[PDB]
Each structure stands twice: as C-alpha cells, then as structure tokens.
C-alpha cells in the first residue's frame, strides 16, 4: 500500500501562519510529484501548488505566490505546506495528493491524503451547552450550542437508537462559535414511555454531556 | 487562468439510468484533463485521466469522451455509490484550474417534508437567549425554503440553516433552521412560526406556537 498521512487539525488566528505536513508511506518519496489542494466549507476544489520531492523544485499558483511555500524533507519522506498571513478565506481542508507523473508531466492525483482542516478564527476552545428539543410521528432532539472548534459527535441512548436519527451540519454563528442540532423521529406512542437521551462528545474541551429529552 | 465550466451544476436520476455531465475548457487543453469523484464526507478520488482513460479500480460503467475542448463523463447505469460531486481539472497550463463541480444524487418520488417546531428550552432562557428551531424532515427534492414570522412579521438575517446529505435508506433530505433572539426580544412577541415551501407542497405549510 502507498498512502499519504497528513498532520492533524489546526486552529490559527487571523494574521498567523500555519504549516501542514504530509508524509508518504510505502514507496519512494522521489518517484512522483505531489500536489496541495484545498476546499473551503461548502465550496469546490482549489489548486495551491506542486513539487519535485527529489529536487525540491516547486510551483505555486499565481494567486498564492509569495504567500505560501512548499518544502519537503527527504530524510523522512515528508512534504510541508506553509500558509502565511491567514484570513477567514483560508479556512478549509487542505489535501496533499500524489500525481501519477506519466512522461515527466502532471498526469493526475491518484493518491490523496486524508486532509487536514485548518480553521482561521479568534475563538478559543469552548465546550457546548446542550438544550432539549422537546416533543408535543413525533420529533424530538437536542440543540448543541456555542462550541469551538468542530467536531462534536451525537448519539442517542448510547447507540441503541439509530433509526430515524438526523444529525445536522454545524453552522457558524457570528460569535465564532458553532451550533448544531440532532433530531430523531419516534412513534408518538413511545413518548411518555420510552426514555430518550442524546449523548454529546466534544474532544477539544473534553466535554461529554448526556441530556434526557422529554415532552 | 483557463476556465473550466461544468454543467449541469446539479443532476438527479434513478438507479440504473444513463447520465452524462459536461466540462468545457475556455481554450484548447489537448487531452490534459482529469476527473475526480468526491463522495459525501470524503476526499476526492481519481476517476478518469487523459480525458478518456479509466483509473484502475473504476467500474466499466464509467467512460469519458473528448470532443474538442468539451469533455463529458457517462455513467451507463447510475448506482448509489456514484453519488457525490464530480470535479474536472485541467493539467495543461499553470495554474491548474478546477471546474466548479457537478453534484449527483439519486432521484426518488417527490416527498413533502414533515415539519416540526420547537420553542426554546426554559434552560436556555435562564442563560438569556432563545433558540427556536424549525425541522423539515425527509423530503426528497433537495430544494426547500423556510420563512420565519414573528407576530406575522417576516424575519431576516437573524436565522441560520443546514441540510443533511442524502439519506441512503430513503434517499431523502432533512433541514433544520434556527431562529435566534435575545431573551428580552423573544418575550416581547407571542406567535412564532416557520413557513415551509417545497415542491411536494401545493401550498406552503406553517407551523407555529404562542410562547406561554
């Protein structure tokens, strides 16, 4: 297997710099070109640059020229993407990807890294407040409010309740804090009888809250 | 920049139906064009390169065709695992640009959303804020609209919404909307309503409550 392992999620303030790392396993680091690509939330793919891991030669997209640098360390088979003077527009998942490199030319990105989310924000790490969404063919849920950074995970009755469960994409409030909801639809005949608890996990803040949702 | 124009932006079809979408280069890029498939929640994956060549692992159902600067992909029979967004990329000249993508989903019978409205918890109100949620559940056509009305006054800029990826089980979508007011503001008004418009609704449904 040839795989690309990237560095974990980052949070950076506006004006700061970030450096992402991408490590190639299972083959010669110098045999193929390597690309950086990014995708902002809800948007499409964007090419940043690519490089010669043997020689170190690299090209960056005109848009980012002078603002980014692509390096590598051959001893460890690792590429690096540095982005300086960060703004909100730089929030995205950043991917490294190996090119097929046929005929000493860009041929296509056949092996992708798992990507690293880079969040540009002034927010500081915050656990969620969890509020019930109370029922009265019935829907209920919990509102998970004001947490930073993503993600949180939500289960229901510790995993026993799966069918009918919808956990929504978080939205970004003006505060810099995320909010999501998770709902479940159950038979209305279950309401006074079956107990319903949402289990919320936020690793950054080490919060785990279990909230029982009743009419 | 060479611009790549993908059409249509969105594409829906039944399992086993034949589909085609297009990528058009603003100038000749020779055969130096590639496709990536991005499944929901995952990273892009190499599909077709040299405009016509299938990557290893890729099913025979996929093909691609070049006519001049116009590049097309054809899926002979659409399957649920084909769902996601398809991007084309030109490798001809710097910068190597991406198309805007075409998002493919599975078409099913039209389904109107089931709508539910949740007043804020007494718990949140103690804290000094009120979130009012509008749930639109299990509707197929992805397109849907919510209007918030407070004592029959249309709200703007004070709400936010998000929608799920297509559910594998029923091929539907859901949407949650949140109206967020201060506690002081929430308590000055009586009727809170979310008005839903969807293709599956011949007329808009309104769900409401009076606080208190």
């Amino acid at each position: 297997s040839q795989y690309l392992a990237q560095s974990g999620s980052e949070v950076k303030k506006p004006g700061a710099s970030v450096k992402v790392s991408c490590r190639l396993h299972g083959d010669k680091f110098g045999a193929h070109y390597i690309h950086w690509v990014r995708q902002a939330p809800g948007q499409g793919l964007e090419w940043l640059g690519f490089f010669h891991p043997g020689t170190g030669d690299a090209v960056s997209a005109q848009k980012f020229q002078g603002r980014i640098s692509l390096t590598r360390d051959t001893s460890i088979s690792t590429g690096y993407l540095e982005v300086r003077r960060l703004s909100s527009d730089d929030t995205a998942v950043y991917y490294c990807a190996r090119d097929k490199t046929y005929s000493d030319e860009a041929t296509g990105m056949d092996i992708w890294g798992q990507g690293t989310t880079v969040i540009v924000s002034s927010a500081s790490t915050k656990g969620p407040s969890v509020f019930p969404l109370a029922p009265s063919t019935a829907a209920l849920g919990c509102l998970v409010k004001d947490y930073f950074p993503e993600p949180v995970t939500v289960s229901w009755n510790s995993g026993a309740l799966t069918s009918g469960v919808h956990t929504f994409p978080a939205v970004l409030q003006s505060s810099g804090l995320y909010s999501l909801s998770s709902v479940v639809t159950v038979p209305s005949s279950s309401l006074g009888t079956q107990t319903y608890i949402c289990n919320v996990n936020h690793k950054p803040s080490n919060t785990k809250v279990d909230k029982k949702v009743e009419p | 920049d060479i611009k790549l124009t993908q059409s249509p932006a969105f594409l829906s079809a039944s399992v086993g139906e034949r589909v085609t979408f297009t990528c058009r280069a603003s100038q000749d890029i020779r055969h130096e064009l590639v496709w990536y498939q991005q499944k929901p929640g995952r990273g892009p994956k190499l599909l077709i390169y040299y405009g016509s060549t299938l990557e290893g692992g890729v099913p025979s159902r996929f093909s691609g065709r070049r006519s001049g600067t116009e590049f097309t992909v054809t899926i002979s029979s659409l399957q649920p695992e084909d769902v996601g967004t398809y991007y084309c990329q030109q490798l001809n000249s710097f910068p190597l640009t991406f198309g805007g993508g075409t998002t493919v989903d599975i078409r099913r019978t039209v389904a109107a959303p089931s709508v539910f409205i949740f007043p804020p918890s007494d718990e949140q109100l103690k804290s000094g804020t009120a979130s009012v949620v509008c749930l639109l559940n299990n509707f197929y056509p992805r397109e849907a609209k919510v209007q918030w009305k407070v004592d029959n006054a249309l709200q703007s800029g004070n709400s936010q919404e998000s929608v799920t990826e297509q559910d594998s089980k029923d091929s539907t979508y859901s949407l949650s909307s949140t109206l967020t007011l201060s506690k002081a503001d929430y308590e000055k008004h009586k009727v809170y309503a979310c008005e839903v418009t969807h293709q599956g609704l011949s007329s808009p449904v309104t769900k409401s409550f009076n606080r208190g």
Binding site: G30, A31, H32, Y33, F50, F51, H52, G54, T55, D57, A58, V59, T101, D104, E105, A106 | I29, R30, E32, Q90, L91, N92, S93, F94, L96
Partner: peptide, 8 residues
C-alpha cells in the same frame, strides 16, 4: 502540459 522536472 506541465512538469516540474524529471523524476530520476
């Protein structure tokens, strides 16, 4: 179309 130099 584009290259960043020959591998090997």
């Amino acid at each position: 179309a584009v290259g960043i130099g020959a591998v090997f």
